[PDB]
């Protein structure tokens, strides 16, 4: 149902079954499918397509020519009723594409809250994007990719299937990310390699001097010590006992399937 | 007001206050905001969004899915009444984005005349594009970038914030430009480095043999002499006394804030 306080432009097409929240705005020439839920205060500016089994949160701003919930590009996909979930206060810019999941990948593409998805950013099937992320122009997440909180992905960067971009990571523009990026790391190149800790990001987000030093020490264990990952894991866990910010490494290691960028 | 000789398609939405010039053409499903001025003979093919405080000149051709005058992607922008100015006879292709300025950056995004902006070219807030430029497919100008007359920016190239692309420059495809590019230079790579003078461009644009040689000599002063820029500046100014085409270097040096690509 369409809330009495929602605005639906006369030229927009909202299919019977769609749920449109209070003070939402469906602009001219938008198409909203029957399995779509659009939350309170969310704005579709104009020329937006939203379809599939798709739930969108509150106070989002979705710009013209975006395609949200659409059939994904996986050749294995066969029309199964998979899903998209998008949180609150996202800015989803012109020509952004966010595709529905595949059964094989878990059935769900998920985006958190307070993200900025810049022009032509692509979120393929089965991706999970956290909160407070930035995907710059033409940033492309291939299928099954995870982008953790606060991560920034530079212009024209592609993240290969199944890779994890850790929390507070900075990926430089025109990069190709072929393996997992630990949290707090600056990554650049094709294939992408590590270039130290994202110190400025940590500063801006209220990390203490002690936390930043500990994170740098963990980085050094992984990349400077000359030891294998299996050797340094307990050392990092040991370090995390004093500085809890370091636990992000541990949690990331447990999820990592493609090995670390080096 | 809409000129009596303008065509506005019945499906187009031209908001009260918009100024539409003589023999302009507003195609199907276009949206034109109340602060927009569209000059004589300018054509919006279909599915074009033009908004903000935006002035567009004469005889432009703007293709489907372009977004002109839109809210920029700067996280600092807060809705201030900033501006876009576009000149005459531009060809603005499918999915091109040209965003309004920020107060912090000067309030204005400007594009000159006789430019070709190819598919998905992006002109961020506070950019200034001159005349007779080409931005190839997916060419991306970050905020505050200047592109001078006759410059050609290759496919998938990103120009980083505040950088200047000098007049008659050729930037190779898939480049990442992190510093200023002197006029007349061929630049390529990530980060982009110089690869000599754009001789063919100078030939095609009527530069004399003497002018081209002088320009090559100036290039050699900057890049081959082994001297610092401060040392070679007066030598270039000296050379410009005989060959006025060399003055472009002087004028560029005065504007450059990020140092030169090397």
């Amino acid at each position: 149902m369409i809330d009495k306080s929602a605005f639906v432009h006369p030229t927009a097409i909202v299919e019977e079954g769609a749920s449109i929240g209070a003070n939402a705005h469906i602009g001219p020439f938008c198409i909203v499918g029957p399995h779509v839920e659009i939350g309170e205060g969310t704005v579709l500016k104009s020329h937006v397509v939203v379809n599939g089994h798709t739930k969108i949160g509150r106070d989002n701003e979705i710009y013209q020519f975006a395609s949200i919930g659409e059939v994904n590009q996986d050749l294995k996909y066969a029309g199964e009723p998979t899903r998209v979930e998008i949180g609150d206060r996202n800015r989803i810019r012109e020509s952004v594409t966010i595709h529905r999941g595949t059964v094989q990948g878990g059935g769900l593409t998920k985006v958190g809250s307070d993200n900025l998805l810049m022009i032509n950013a692509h979120i393929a099937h089965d991706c999970t994007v956290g909160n407070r992320c930035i995907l710059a122009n033409n940033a492309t997440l291939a299928g099954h990719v995870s982008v953790d909180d606060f991560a920034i992905i530079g212009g024209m960067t592609a993240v290969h299937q199944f890779c994890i971009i850790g929390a507070h990571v900075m990926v430089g523009g025109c990069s190709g990310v072929a393996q997992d990026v630990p949290p707090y790391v600056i990554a650049q190149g094709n294939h992408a390699t590590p270039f130290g800790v994202n110190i400025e990001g940590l500063k801006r987000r209220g990390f203490s001097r002690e936390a930043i030093t500990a994170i740098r020490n963990a980085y050094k264990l992984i990349y400077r010590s000359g030891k294998t990952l299996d050797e340094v894991k307990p050392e990092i866990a040991e370090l995390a006992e004093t500085y809890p910010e370091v636990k992000a490494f541990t949690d990331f290691f447990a999820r990592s399937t493609r090995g670390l960028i080096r | 007001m809409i000129d009596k000789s303008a065509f506005v398609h019945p499906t187009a939405i031209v908001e009260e206050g918009a100024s539409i010039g003589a023999n302009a053409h507003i195609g199907p499903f276009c949206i034109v905001g109340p602060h927009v001025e569209i000059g004589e003979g300018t054509v919006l093919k279909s599915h074009v969004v033009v908004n903000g405080h935006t002035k567009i000149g004469r005889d432009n051709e703007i293709y489907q899915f372009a977004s002109i005058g839109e809210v920029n992607q700067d996280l600092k922008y807060a809705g201030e009444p900033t501006r876009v100015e576009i000149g005459d006879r531009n060809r603005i292709r499918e999915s091109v984005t040209i965003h309004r300025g920020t107060v912090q950056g000067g309030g204005l995004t400007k594009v000159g005349s006789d430019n070709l902006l190819m598919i998905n070219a992006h002109i961020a807030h506070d950019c200034t594009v001159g005349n007779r430029c080409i931005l190839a497919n997916n060419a991306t100008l970050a905020g505050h970038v200047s592109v001078d007359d006759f410059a050609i920016i290759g496919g998938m190239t990103a120009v980083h914030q505040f950088c200047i692309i000098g007049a008659h420059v050729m930037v190779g495809g898939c480049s990442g430009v992190a510093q200023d590019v002197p006029p007349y230079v061929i630049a390529q790579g990530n980060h982009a480095t110089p690869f000599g003078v754009n001789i063919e461009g100078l030939k095609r644009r009527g530069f004399s043999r003497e002018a081209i040689t002088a320009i090559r000599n100036a290039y050699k002063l900057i890049y081959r002499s082994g001297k610092t820029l401060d040392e070679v500046k007066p030598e270039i100014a000296e050379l410009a006394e005989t060959y006025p085409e060399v003055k472009a270097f002087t004028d560029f040096f005065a504007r450059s804030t990020r140092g030169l690509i090397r």
Partner: peptide, 12 residues
């Protein structure tokens, strides 16, 4: 510091 998301950097 200035964020340049397209470059993917915090400017020095």
């Amino acid at each position: 510091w200035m964020l340049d998301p397209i470059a993917g950097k915090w400017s020095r």
